[PDB]
Design an enzyme around this catalytic site. Sequence first.
Site, PDB file in Angstrom:
ATOM      1  CE  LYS B  76      -4.566  -0.493   0.761  1.00 19.87           C
ATOM      2  NZ  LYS B  76      -4.775  -1.930   0.819  1.00 19.87           N
ATOM      3  CG  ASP B 119      -9.005  -2.741   6.636  1.00 17.48           C
ATOM      4  OD1 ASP B 119      -9.809  -3.458   5.997  1.00 17.48           O
ATOM      5  OD2 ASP B 119      -7.898  -2.370   6.179  1.00 17.48           O
TER       6      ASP B 119
END
Lengths: 390, 391
Positions: B76, B119
């Site tokens: 990410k 999350d």
Amino acid sequence: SVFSLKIDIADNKFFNGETSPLFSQSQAKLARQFHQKIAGYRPTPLCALDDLANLFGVKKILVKDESKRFGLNAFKMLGGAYAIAQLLCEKYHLDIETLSFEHLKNAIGEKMTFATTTDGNHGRGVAWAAQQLGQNAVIYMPKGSAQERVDAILNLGAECIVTDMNYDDTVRLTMQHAQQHGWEVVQDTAWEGYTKIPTWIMQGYATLADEAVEQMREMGVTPTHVLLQAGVGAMAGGVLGYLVDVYSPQNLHSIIVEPDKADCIYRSGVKGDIVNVIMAGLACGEPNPLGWEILRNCATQFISCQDSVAALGMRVLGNPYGNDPRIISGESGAVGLGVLAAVHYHPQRQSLMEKLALNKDAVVLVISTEGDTDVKHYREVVWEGKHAVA
Amino acid sequence: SVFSLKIDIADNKFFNGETSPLFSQSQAKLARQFHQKIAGYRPTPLCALDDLANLFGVKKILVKDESKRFGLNAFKMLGGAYAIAQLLCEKYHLDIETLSFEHLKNAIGEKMTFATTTDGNHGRGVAWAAQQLGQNAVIYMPKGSAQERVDAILNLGAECIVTDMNYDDTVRLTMQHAQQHGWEVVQDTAWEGYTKIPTWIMQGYATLADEAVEQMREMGVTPTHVLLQAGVGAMAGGVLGYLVDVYSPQNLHSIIVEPDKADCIYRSGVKGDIVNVTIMAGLACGEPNPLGWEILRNCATQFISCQDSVAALGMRVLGNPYGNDPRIISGESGAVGLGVLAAVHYHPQRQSLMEKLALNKDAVVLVISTEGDTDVKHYREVVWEGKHAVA
């Protein structure tokens, strides 16, 4: 997570630490001298699982990886092959020290037929040796036996028959047929009137212990503990007999591990006398009297565990913690390691560690007796999560 | 054994093969040039699972292992850091293309505060970039969040607040507080009025695809398939956009993979319009990312909605490889693409499923492992304890 697998621990009250001149250093070295001469011989790895050790709160966990034992994926040929070579030398007036496999494989004349019941590894060791030494093997396997295991024996030039009967009734059949056809029974257990062959087998097994001690010295470590999985106790007897001759029985905390539906040694350890009572390799019926003698004299503790502890062991070995090496270990191969993991995640961790005298200083020797000898089952466990913990 | 895990496959009836100039080779090249200036840059391995490919009856299975990405244990940051640097350059009137990341680290100006809901991985990437650039970050995580992931963010000098709300609601709290304080919201999805930042994120993600193509070319192979796991589809959109620019959407059999309890792309794919759909971290979806959905609707070959336990199976298969294959540490969301192949292999309808997916002995299958063991407790419960078993 926190989970409770059944780990029954019994102190060996019958302990007297009497060591065995019979299963000691000197015989192990003779056996190893025989193995060193077999093509492709190389000591199996002794893997240091330093990162698992840190997690479990011990100093070191050492795993002898018998999946690398020649091409057999298990330790058994160490005994089976030694015994078979001794039988041949005795019958045909040869010298074990100068035995030629090439000569024996090709020679004409009288041939022995070796007859054996197996649930997998023992029979494959016998088949391999017969093939190497130009002899015959007839291997019996009980109902439910894996086809891969059957094929492994067939691929060694042995006959292999799967019966409609269990392990014990299959052994009796092997015996009846052998008597009838003049075969030489080669089982890895002893009974009244049958000790010579299983003695050599147990002496041969100690090769792995001799290798392991050499490897621990090379590592500059001394074992405080050993976990030994036990069917009839041939391996544990041969291996403990050796280790205890090197380190003394008082200075080695030894733990015998069995599944609870065939825990013949455990049940004998509470009673103090042999008791007749399953994941392949650890079947029993009745303890091997020769192994039993060693264990009751010299074993620190017996463990009776539920079968899923073995499956936990397989997974932990197959996908190691941190940077540790990976080890492919079969159901009976992994069950020693499984116990350490089951302890680690148990709600009763602290008091189980205290009972096993496992602490920050402990150097634990573990034996992985086989790799993935049944790959279908191996992958069901490690990939499908069969015999899950919860 | 033979077992049946839910694997629903839907052909994309909306496929038109319209590529996206916005998510293509050139922007990915630009992003990669940026990433190459960051300390610790190394293309992540592309592992050849040859023995598993033989077992499954395809030619090759290639896993892009994003657990190796900069020490973050997931892909990410490729997006998040690129967006953060773009935003800082924009504020300071700098040209991101003609400077180093270290020049940026020591840049002088008014401090920025980046605000984000996550999350797990996305917010970690934001926190990481903020720390590097001497800026502030404020991360919100929803009820249920693994303490380890909270701690990963805290260890990066960012604030991290675990709310009582679910993902969708918590995102709203982030927008609220940002408006309230003058923070810059950095989310990896788009909505009306918010598309600049998620565009950068998706372009940044394409670096992993650029690397993989270079790696495949060095291996001398061409992929026939790609499996892409999709939360909101920012990763799938960005990566499929790049790949389909390289390979043509007609010659790439792309399969989007979602858990059935949040299969927002799948549901949108069967319906045609965007459908608003506990969930394994990384693959949460409220509504599809419109930027991603556009690419997928246009260019994806198939959508898969699958059982949760498919991902668990993938984690184990990657972590304890077959034959002599290399081993890969892959988290629940990281492993689900590979899980699909394994579920197909053991399924009683293996033959028709393979036919549906056009998997055969010539198939070369690119899989992305988007994260390693970002939750070590869960990872070990799956691979050791057999949590989320097949049976």
